[PDB]
Design a protein around this ligand. Structure first.
Ligand code: HEM
Ligand code: HEM
Ligand code: HEM
Ligand code: HEM
Lengths: 141, 146, 141, 146
C-alpha cells in the first residue's frame, strides 16, 4: 500500500540522507555480504572486501534505484521496470535476498539517522522497501 | 553458535553498554509497530492504536525488559542455546502459538535497535556477529514446534 | 504479475473444479488446521473437527472469495477490498498464515485434479494464490 | 520427529507405494518451474527454458531420484535427522549456498507431488504427518548455516 504518511516519511528520511545515499548503500551491501554470506554468490566478480571499489560503486547503483523508487513511488512498477527483468529474469535472485538487503538498509539508515529513524519512519521505510522488493521479484509472480 | 573470539569480543563489549531497562522495550515496541499483526498477542496490554501509544506503554516497556533478560541469558550461554530456551519455547510454541518467524523479526528489530543506539560502533562485523546470535536465539525458541 | 497464460490456466483449473469449490475449500482448511496447528488460534469458536459444519461453511466462504478473485483477477485489489480490511485490520492475520493455506489449497487441487494440475498450472495457481494473499495482507504494507 | 505410531503407520505405508524413479524428479522439476530462481542452481543441466523442457530433462529426473534417496534415508532415520544429513547440509550450505527456504519449498512441492500421486489416499492426517517430516528434513539440512 504506502499511505499518504508513509510516502511523507519516506520522502523525508531520504531528504535527510541526501548525498550520502550511495555511501550508505555501499555500507548496507557490505553488512549483507558479511551477515548473510549466502548472498555473496551473486557477486563472484566482486572484490567483497571492505574498501572495495566495486561494492562502493554498487552501493551507488542500489542507492540511485532506491531514489528513483522514492521519486515515482506512486509508479515504481514502470520505473523499476528494467531492474525487475534484470534481477528476476536474468539474475534469478532468490527473493529471500531482498529481505536480507532491506534489513541491512534499515540497520544502515538507523545507524546513521537516529533523530529521523522514528518507530513510524522505521515502519514506512520497511513498507517502502518491501514494495520495491515486491516489484523487483514480480516477474516471478 | 560458534562465535569466534573476535566476534565474541564484539558481542560482549556492546551488550555491556546496552540500557537493558529501555532497549528491550524499544525493540518490542518497534515490532508491534512495524509488524502490526504481532499486536494480536498483546490485546491485554492497552492502547496500541498509535505507535506513540505503543512506545510509552508501560506494559510494553515492562515486558521488553523481560525479553532482553532472556537474551542476556542466551548471549552468554551460547553453548546450549537450546537448553536455556526450552521452557520459553514451550510457552510460545504450544502455549501462545507464535509462529517462529516473528522470532526472526524481533531478532532483526533488535538488530535495528542496537544499530540505532550505538551508531557507527555498530559496524558491519559486529552486526554479522549479532545476526548469528539472534538467529541462534530464534532457532532455540522455535525448537518445540517439531 | 499473472500473465495472459496464468490467467488462462487459473481460468481453467477453476473451470474444472466447479461446484466442488466449497468442498475443497473446506478440505484445504482442515489440512491446515491439521498440518500447521498454529493457525488453529484464529478459530477458537470453531469446532475444528473433521465433520465440522463451521469449517464446512467456512470452506464455502474461502472458496467464494477465491472465485471472486478469478473473476476480477485483473482487479482483485478493489474486489477483495473488504477482506483485506477484515484480515489485516480487524483480524491481524500473520501473513505467514497465507502461505500455509495457499499450500493446502494446492495440495487439495492436486489431490483432486491430476489431469489438470500440470507443472505449469501448479505454477499459475501458486502465483495466483500469492496475489490474493498479497492483496489480503496489503493493509500491513 | 516424534511421529506417533499412527502417523508413523501413515508415512511408511505411502512411501512403499512411491515410484522412486519418477517421483523425485516430478518434485525437483516442479520446483524449478514453480520457483524459477532455483534454476540458478542447475544451469549445468541443460535447457530449462520451458517447463516441458524441465519435465523431460534426464539430468533433472537423474538428480531427483538422488533427492528422494536422501528422503528415504531420512524418513526412516528420524531419530537423528541431523546426523543423517550433515554431509548434505555441508554441501548445500557452505558449498552451494542454497538458502534454507528452498528446503521448505522442495519439502512442500514434495507434499504436492505425493498428493497428486495418491489423491484421496493423501488425507489431511497423512499430510499432517508428512509435513512434520519434510520439516524435519528442511531443518536438518539447514543446520550447518549456524
Ligand atoms: C531494493 C533492492 C535492490 C535494489 C534497488 C537493486 C538495484 C540494483 C541496481 C540499480 C543494479 C544495476 C542496474 C544497472 O545495471 O544499471 C543492480 C545490480 C545487481 N543486483 Fe541488485 N538491487 C537490489 C537488491 C539486490 C539483491 C537482493 C541481490 C542479491 C543478493 C542483488 C543482486 C544484484 C546483482 C548481482 C546485480 C548485478 C551486479 C553486476 O553483475 O554488476 N540485488 N541492483
Ligand atoms: C527472541 C524472541 C523472544 C524472546 C526472548 C521472548 C521472551 C519472552 C519472555 C521473557 C516472556 C515471558 C516470561 C514470563 O512470563 O515469565 C515472553 C512472553 C511472551 N511473548 Fe515473548 N519472546 C520472544 C518472541 C516473541 C514474539 C515474536 C512474540 C509474538 C508476537 C512473543 C509474544 C509473547 C507473549 C504475548 C508473551 C506473553 C506471555 C504471557 O504473559 O502469557 N514473544 N516472551
Ligand atoms: C487466500 C486466502 C484466504 C481467503 C480468500 C479468505 C477469505 C475469507 C473469507 C471470504 C472470509 C469471510 C468473509 C465474510 O465475512 O463474509 C474469511 C474469514 C476469516 N479468515 Fe480468511 N481467507 C483466507 C485466508 C485466511 C488465513 C490465512 C487465515 C488465518 C489462519 C484466515 C483467518 C480468517 C478468520 C479467522 C476469519 C473469520 C472467521 C470467523 O470469525 O467467522 N483467513 N476469510
Ligand atoms: C530436502 C532438500 C534437499 C535434498 C534431500 C537434497 C539432496 C541432494 C543430494 C542427494 C544431492 C547430491 C548428492 C551427491 O552429489 O552425491 C544434492 C545436490 C544438489 N542440490 Fe540438493 N537437496 C535438497 C534441496 C536442494 C534445493 C532446495 C536446492 C536449491 C535450489 C538444491 C540444489 C542442489 C544442487 C544444485 C545440487 C547439485 C550438487 C552438485 O552436483 O554440485 N538442493 N541435493
Amino acid at each position: 500500500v504506502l499511505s499518504p504518511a508513509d510516502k511523507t516519511n519516506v520522502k523525508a528520511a531520504w531528504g535527510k540522507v541526501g548525498a550520502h545515499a550511495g555511501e550508505y548503500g555501499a555500507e548496507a551491501l557490505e553488512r549483507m555480504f558479511l551477515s548473510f554470506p549466502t548472498t555473496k554468490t551473486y557477486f563472484p566478480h566482486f572484490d567483497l572486501s571492505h574498501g572495495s571499489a566495486q561494492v562502493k560503486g554498487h552501493g551507488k547503483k542500489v542507492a540511485d534505484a532506491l531514489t528513483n523508487a522514492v521519486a515515482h513511488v506512486d509508479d515504481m512498477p514502470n520505473a523499476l521496470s528494467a531492474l525487475s527483468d534484470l534481477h528476476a529474469h536474468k539474475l534469478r535472485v532468490d527473493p529471500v535476498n531482498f529481505k536480507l538487503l532491506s534489513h541491512c538498509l534499515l540497520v544502515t539508515l538507523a545507524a546513521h539517522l537516529p533523530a529521523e529513524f522514528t518507530p513510524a519512519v522505521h515502519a514506512s521505510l520497511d513498507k517502502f522497501l518491501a514494495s520495491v522488493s515486491t516489484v523487483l521479484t514480480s516477474k516471478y509472480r | 553458535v560458534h562465535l569466534t573470539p573476535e566476534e565474541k569480543s564484539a558481542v560482549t563489549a556492546l551488550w555491556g553498554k546496552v540500557n537493558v531497562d529501555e532497549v528491550g522495550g524499544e525493540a518490542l515496541g518497534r515490532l508491534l509497530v512495524v509488524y502490526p499483526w504481532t499486536q494480536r498477542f498483546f490485546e491485554s496490554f492497552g492502547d496500541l492504536s498509535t505507535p506513540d501509544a505503543v512506545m510509552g506503554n508501560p506494559k510494553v516497556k515492562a515486558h521488553g525488559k523481560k525479553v532482553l533478560g532472556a537474551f542476556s541469558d542466551g548471549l552468554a550461554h551460547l553453548d546450549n542455546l537450546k537448553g536455556t530456551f526450552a521452557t520459553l519455547s514451550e510457552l510460545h510454541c504450544d502455549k501462545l502459538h507464535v509462529d517462529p518467524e516473528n522470532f526472526r523479526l524481533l531478532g532483526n528489530v533488535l538488530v535495528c535497535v542496537l544499530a540505532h543506539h550505538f551508531g557507527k560502533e555498530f559496524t558491519p562485523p559486529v552486526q554479522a556477529a549479532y545476526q548469528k546470535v539472534v538467529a541462534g536465539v530464534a532457532n532455540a525458541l522455535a525448537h518445540k514446534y517439531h
